[PDB]
Structure 1
Amino acid sequence: HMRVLGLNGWPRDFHDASAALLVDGRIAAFAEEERLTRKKHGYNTAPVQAAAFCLAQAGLTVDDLDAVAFGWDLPAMYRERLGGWPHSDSEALDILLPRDVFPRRTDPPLHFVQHHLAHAASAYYFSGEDRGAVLIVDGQGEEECVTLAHAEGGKITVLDTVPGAWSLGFFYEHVSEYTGLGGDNPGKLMGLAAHGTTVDETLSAFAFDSDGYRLNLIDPQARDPEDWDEYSVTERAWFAHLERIYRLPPNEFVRRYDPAKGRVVRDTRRDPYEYRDLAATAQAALERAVFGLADSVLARTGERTLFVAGGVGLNATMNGKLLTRSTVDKMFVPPVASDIGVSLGAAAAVAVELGDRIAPMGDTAAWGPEFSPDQVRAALDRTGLAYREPANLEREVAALIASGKVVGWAQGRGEVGPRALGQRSLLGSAHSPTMRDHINLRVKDREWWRPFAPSMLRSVSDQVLEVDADFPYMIMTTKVRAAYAERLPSVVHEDWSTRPQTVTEASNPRYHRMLTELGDLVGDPVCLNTSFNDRGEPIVSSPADALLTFSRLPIDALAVGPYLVTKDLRH
Structure 2
Amino acid sequence: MRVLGLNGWPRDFHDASAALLVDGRIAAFAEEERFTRKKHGYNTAPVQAAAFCLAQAGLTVDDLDAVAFGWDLPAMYRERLGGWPHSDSEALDILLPRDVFPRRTDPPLHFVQHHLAHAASAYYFSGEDRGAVLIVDGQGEEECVTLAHAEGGKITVLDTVPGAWSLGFFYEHVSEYTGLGGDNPGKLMGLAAHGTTVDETLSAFAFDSDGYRLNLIDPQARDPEDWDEYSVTERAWFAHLERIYRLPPNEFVRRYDPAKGRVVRDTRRDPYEYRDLAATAQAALERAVFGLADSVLARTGERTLFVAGGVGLNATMNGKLLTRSTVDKMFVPPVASDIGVSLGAAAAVAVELGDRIAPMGDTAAWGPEFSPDQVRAALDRTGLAYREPANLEREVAALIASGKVVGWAQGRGEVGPRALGQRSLLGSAHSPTMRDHINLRVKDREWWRPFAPSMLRSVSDQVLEVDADFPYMIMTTKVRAAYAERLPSVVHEDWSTRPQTVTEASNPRYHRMLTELGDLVGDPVCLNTSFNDRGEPIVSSPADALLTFSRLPIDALAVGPYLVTK
Deviations 1:207-261 (A, max 9, x none): 0000000000000010111110000110000000000000000000000000000
The aligned counterpart of 1:190 is 189
Shift of 1:494: 4.6
Aligned length: 566
Shift of 1:479: 1.3
* Matched position secondary structure for 2:99: coil
The aligned counterpart of 2:340 is 341
Structure 2 Cα separation of the partners of residues 470 and 382 of structure 1: 41
Runs of at least 5 residues in structure 1 that lack an aligned partner in the other structure = none
* Matched position secondary structure for 1:270: coil
The aligned counterpart of 2:381 is 382
* Matched position secondary structure for 2:515: helix
The aligned counterpart of 1:478 is 477
Deviations 1:335-381 (A, max 9, x none): 00000000000000000000000000000000000000000001001
Deviations 1:153-173 (A, max 9, x none): 000000000000000000000
The aligned counterpart of 2:425 is 426
The aligned counterpart of 1:454 is 453
The 5 A counterparts of 1:412-561 are: 412-561=411-560
Structure 1 Cα separation of the partners of residues 173 and 269 of structure 2: 17
Deviations 1:57-115 (A, max 9, x none): 00000000000000000000000000010000000000000000000000000000000
Structure 2 Cα separation of the partners of residues 502 and 175 of structure 1: 32
- Answer yes or no: is the 8 Å Cα contact 2:453–2:527 preserved in 1: yes
Structure 2 Cα separation of the partners of residues 330 and 527 of structure 1: 26
Structure 1 Cα separation of the partners of residues 428 and 394 of structure 2: 15
Shift of 1:462: 1.0
Structure 1 Cα separation of the partners of residues 527 and 384 of structure 2: 27
Shift of 1:284: 0.3
Structure 1 Cα separation of the partners of residues 55 and 217 of structure 2: 47
Structure 2 Cα separation of the partners of residues 84 and 157 of structure 1: 29
Structure 1 Cα separation of the partners of residues 494 and 291 of structure 2: 24
Structure 1 Cα separation of the partners of residues 424 and 230 of structure 2: 33
Structure 2 Cα separation of the partners of residues 293 and 121 of structure 1: 19
- Answer yes or no: is the 8 Å Cα contact 2:315–2:475 preserved in 1: yes
Structure 2 Cα separation of the partners of residues 382 and 243 of structure 1: 54
Structure 1 Cα separation of the partners of residues 86 and 176 of structure 2: 35
The aligned counterpart of 2:174 is 175
Shift of 1:446: 1.9
* Matched position secondary structure for 2:403: coil
Deviations 1:246-286 (A, max 9, x none): 00000000000000000000000000000000000000000
TM-score by length of 1: 0.99
Structure 1 Cα separation of the partners of residues 201 and 122 of structure 2: 29
The aligned counterpart of 2:16 is 17
* Matched position secondary structure for 1:340: helix
Deviations 1:167-226 (A, max 9, x none): 000000000000000000000000011111011000000000000000000000101111
The aligned counterpart of 2:368 is 369
Structure 2 Cα separation of the partners of residues 210 and 420 of structure 1: 36
* Matched position secondary structure for 1:68: strand
* Matched position secondary structure for 2:489: coil
Structure 1 Cα separation of the partners of residues 352 and 493 of structure 2: 48
Q: Relative to structure 2, which stretch is displaced further, 475-484 or 144-153?
A: 475-484
Shift of 1:29: 0.2
* Matched position secondary structure for 2:564: strand
State the percentage of identical aligned residues. Answer: 100
Shift of 1:481: 1.5
Structure 2 Cα separation of the partners of residues 225 and 32 of structure 1: 31
Shift of 1:299: 0.4
Shift of 1:445: 1.8
TM-score by length of 2: 1.00
Structure 2 Cα separation of the partners of residues 494 and 480 of structure 1: 12
* Matched position secondary structure for 1:42: coil
Structure 1 Cα separation of the partners of residues 474 and 508 of structure 2: 21
Shift of 1:495: 3.9
Structure 1 Cα separation of the partners of residues 486 and 35 of structure 2: 38
Structure 1 Cα separation of the partners of residues 241 and 275 of structure 2: 14
Deviations 1:3-49 (A, max 9, x none): 00000000000000000000000000000000111000000000000
Structure 2 Cα separation of the partners of residues 370 and 458 of structure 1: 24
The 5 A counterparts of 1:353-368 are: 353-368=352-367
Structure 2 Cα separation of the partners of residues 495 and 531 of structure 1: 22
- Answer yes or no: is the 8 Å Cα contact 2:194–2:493 preserved in 1: no
The aligned counterpart of 1:292 is 291
Deviations 1:305-337 (A, max 9, x none): 000000000000000000000000000000000
Shift of 1:483: 1.3
Q: Relative to structure 2, which stretch is displaced further, 459-468 or 280-289?
A: 459-468
Structure 2 Cα separation of the partners of residues 72 and 121 of structure 1: 13
* Matched position secondary structure for 1:564: strand
Structure 1 Cα separation of the partners of residues 327 and 391 of structure 2: 44
* Matched position secondary structure for 2:295: helix
Shift of 1:406: 0.4
Deviations 1:501-538 (A, max 9, x none): 00001000000000000000000000000000122000
The 5 A counterparts of 1:63-462 are: 63-462=62-461
Deviations 1:406-425 (A, max 9, x none): 00000000000000000000
Structure 2 Cα separation of the partners of residues 240 and 465 of structure 1: 42
Shift of 1:433: 0.4
* Matched position secondary structure for 2:490: coil
Shift of 1:497: 1.2
Structure 2 Cα separation of the partners of residues 451 and 67 of structure 1: 43
Shift of 1:493: 2.5
* Matched position secondary structure for 1:511: helix
Shift of 1:496: 3.0
Gap change, CA 1:494 and 1:242, over 3 Å in 2? closer
* Matched position secondary structure for 1:248: coil
Structure 1 Cα separation of the partners of residues 177 and 324 of structure 2: 31
Structure 2 Cα separation of the partners of residues 412 and 553 of structure 1: 22
* Matched position secondary structure for 1:363: coil
- Answer yes or no: is the 8 Å Cα contact 2:211–2:292 preserved in 1: yes
Structure 2 Cα separation of the partners of residues 493 and 65 of structure 1: 46
Shift of 1:466: 1.2
Q: Relative to structure 2, which stretch is displaced further, 486-495 or 267-276?
A: 486-495
Q: Relative to structure 2, which stretch is displaced further, 341-350 or 484-493?
A: 484-493
- Answer yes or no: is the 8 Å Cα contact 2:193–2:494 preserved in 1: no
- Answer yes or no: is the 8 Å Cα contact 2:147–2:159 preserved in 1: yes
Runs of at least 5 residues in structure 2 that lack an aligned partner in the other structure = none
Query: Considering only aligned residues, what root-mean-square deviation do their CA atoms show, in Å?
Result: 0.5
* Matched position secondary structure for 1:307: strand
* Matched position secondary structure for 2:338: coil
